[PDB]
């Protein structure tokens, strides 16, 4: 089997992409965040706390006949940016693009934190990193992907996200009119339960390429791009007036400037992210100042490769017995 389903930004920054998801008989649709970064599929629900609600689509397993509750688990998560949420557990179907997993764990949040409640748009998140993850207590659950990958025809996904449009994941298939050239294919420690490799170095706009190794995690549901501080300075030192600033939280820039592109290494390969990419606009509405697509990891304990590098390529999580990402551009 195969399934393919549009991701669209779910605001003209790129901040998130949300892709349609259907949970339950008669199918409820929602609009989930798809997250390389983490392992649980958790959804608003019929259970969550009214007042944390505003807007989002819920998930009411009553209403699903193929629901049935885990009796005893419960979930809790706690996200890079300190966001959070927790509740019970339903085992139903789950369909994404055509892709049918039957009982996959759904975990009905009863609590989520301030952030999630006030983005309308994002009705949950769909862990795609490894199961080892997962946070369903007593009995850890598996991932989509994990419960998908056996009968898929192959034992992989793609992620083809879009700078300022929509884009594509896909289950079990490499669509190869999606890239040009070729894919490059980069070892993976599961060590940490994430799909972390190492990059072989960097460039700032027409420099020369420094060779140097950067373990990072591949993080669909991570916006921005986190490197080490010697990068960071080094990239922002070529844009005039770029600045860390302590009282915004990291790098900003003269919003009339043009900044210079990113280059990455995977292997011998190159992708490029251009330099609007980097641009995340006003750091409120109005100002001059904006805000910089790539930023320290320093205070993270492990760099991220987020969203912003990840849209300037077709990225192939290969889900084999031992797994491999691949990049390529496009």
Known sequence: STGSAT???????????????????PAQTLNLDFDTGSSDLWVFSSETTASEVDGQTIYTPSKSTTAKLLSGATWSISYGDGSSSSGDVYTDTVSVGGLTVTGQ???????????????????????????TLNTVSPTQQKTFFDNAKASLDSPVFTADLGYHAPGTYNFGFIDTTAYTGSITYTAVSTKQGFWEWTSTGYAVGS?????????????????????PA?????????????????????????????????????????????????????????????????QSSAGIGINIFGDVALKAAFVVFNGATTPTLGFASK
């Open 7 to 25: 991701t669209t930004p779910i605001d003209s920054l790129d901040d998130a992409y949300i892709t349609p998801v259907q949970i339950g008989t």
């Open 207 to 227: 420099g020369t390429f420094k060779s140097t190794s950067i373990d990072g995690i591949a993080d669909t549901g991570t916006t921005l791009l986190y490197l």
């Open 230 to 294: 010697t990068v960071v300075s080094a990239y922002w030192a070529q844009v005039s007036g770029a600045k860390s600033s302590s009282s915004v939280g990291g790098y900003v820039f003269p919003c009339s400037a043009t900044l210079p592109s990113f280059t990455f290494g995977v292997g011998s390969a190159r992708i490029v992210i251009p330099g609007d990419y980097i641009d995340f606009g006003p750091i409120s509405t109005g100002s001059s100042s904006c805000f910089g697509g790539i």
């Open 105 to 131: 764990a759904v975990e009905s949040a009863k609590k989520v934190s301030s952030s999630f409640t006030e983005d309308s748009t994002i009705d949950g998140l769909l862990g795609l990193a490894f199961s």
